[PDB]
Design an enzyme around this catalytic site. Structure first.
Site, PDB file in Angstrom:
ATOM      1  N   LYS A 125       0.843  -1.208   0.000  1.00 37.09           N
ATOM      2  CA  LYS A 125       0.000   0.000   0.000  1.00 37.09           C
ATOM      3  C   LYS A 125       0.885   1.268   0.000  1.00 37.09           C
ATOM      4  CE  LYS A 125      -2.942  -3.228   1.366  1.00 37.09           C
ATOM      5  NZ  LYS A 125      -4.197  -3.999   1.541  1.00 37.09           N
TER       6      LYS A 125
ATOM      7  N   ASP B  72     -22.979  15.194  31.459  1.00 32.97           N
ATOM      8  CA  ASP B  72     -22.656  14.034  32.253  1.00 32.97           C
ATOM      9  C   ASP B  72     -22.165  14.337  33.636  1.00 32.97           C
ATOM     10  OD1 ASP B  72     -23.007  12.595  29.850  1.00 32.97           O
ATOM     11  OD2 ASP B  72     -20.833  11.969  29.804  1.00 32.97           O
TER      12      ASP B  72
END
Ligand code: NA
Ligand code: NA
Length: 327
Positions: free
Chosen positions: A64, A248
């Site tokens: 690649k 949260d």
DNA sequence: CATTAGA
DNA sequence: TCTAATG
């Protein structure tokens, strides 16, 4: 950091793909170790082969790399980038609550678009319903200007319910940051520590408060220690309403705040480095405590922390203001 | 890496 | 229960 960028970057592109579109944990796990190592490598990688010498660098990746080294592209990368199916997964995943598993199932059904998503709100659970509901709002950044307002507010209720409550707004916000993503309130109380078998109401009381007043508009998940929701600033003397924000809150045993608080505040690097440091200084730090190191290899014995300072003192460092907790 | 939903 | 999704 820059000499190996395109490679590491193409690499993570590739990995991230296998993990999401495909269910190739391995290949996906491949690309990342590789992307990890070449990243490290002290030199301009000149060819696959040179890369290849590397640990984790097989022939697939090497291959690649050359193509990419020769042509500023990759086919597989081009193909993927095009691929609607795959484009679609990447997208659905943005919905809070949508994961890849779901992202794929959805597709397979044909929910590719946001609109698709709407026509089938039914096929969606409350989490994801909310994710969809506040889609624009969830992606937008949090002006510290607004942050300040928010914080002011929770601090007000927390105290209001019980004066004993200790709440810290951790995160980047904490670290002075101009904007933030969502609010993170670290919570604790004296009557709750390591042993003293919970007091779930402890979390509960507050959420109730925050809703009571309309700060918390929704619940994503609320358990006995971790609430996950949405908040909103009272949209003033109208013309301008506020965005629905992620919020949260977490209950912590008083005997583990400061480590925790230390920790969530970060930064990701400040932590490691601080962590790496405690190590030499004969210690161990983690999300909850700090234990003196014994030479037998390891050792226990949780040191007593009364503030961010104790922790510093212990490993004997310079108290660093959250401001400069950058690294 | 641990906590919640859900099925 | 396991398996997902969030941090
Ligand atoms: Na090798
Ligand atoms: Na998502």
């Amino acid at each position: 950091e820059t000499l190996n960028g395109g490679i590491t970057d193409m690499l993570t592109e590739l990995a991230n793909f296998e993990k999401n579109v495909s269910q190739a944990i391995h290949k996906y796990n491949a690309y990342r170790k590789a992307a990890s190592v070449i990243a490290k490598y002290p030199h301009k990688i000149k060819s696959g082969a040179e890369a290849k010498k590397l640990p984790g660098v097989g022939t697939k990746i090497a291959e690649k790399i050359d193509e990419f080294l020769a042509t500023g592209k990759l086919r597989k990368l081009e193909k993927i980038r095009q691929d609607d199916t795959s484009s679609s997964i990447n997208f659905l995943t943005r919905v809070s609550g949508i994961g890849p598993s779901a992202a794929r199932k959805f597709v397979d059904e044909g929910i590719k678009t946001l609109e698709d998503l709407r026509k089938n709100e039914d096929k969606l659970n409350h989490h994801q319903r909310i994710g969809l509901k506040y889609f624009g709002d969830f992606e937008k950044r949090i002006p510290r200007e607004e942050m300040l307002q928010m914080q002011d507010i929770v601090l007000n209720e927390v105290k209001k319910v019980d004066s004993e409550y200790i709440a810290t707004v951790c995160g980047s916000f904490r670290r002075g940051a101009e904007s933030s993503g969502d609010m993170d309130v670290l919570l604790t109380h004296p009557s709750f520590t390591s042993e003293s078998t919970k007091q779930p109401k402890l979390l509960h009381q507050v959420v109730e408060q925050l809703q009571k007043v309309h700060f918390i508009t929704d619940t994503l998940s609320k358990g006995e220690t971790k609430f996950m929701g949405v908040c909103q600033l009272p949209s003033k003397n109208d013309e301008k309403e506020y965005p629905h924000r992620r919020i949260d809150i977490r209950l912590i045993p008083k005997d583990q705040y400061y480590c925790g608080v230390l920790y969530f505040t970060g930064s990701d690097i400040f932590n490691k480095n601080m962590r790496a440091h405690a190590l030499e200084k004969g210690f161990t730090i983690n999300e909850y405590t700090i234990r003196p190191l014994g030479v037998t290899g390891v050792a226990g014995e949780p040191l007593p922390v009364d503030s961010e300072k104790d922790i510093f003192d212990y490993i004997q460092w310079k108290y660093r203001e959250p401001k400069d907790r950058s690294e």
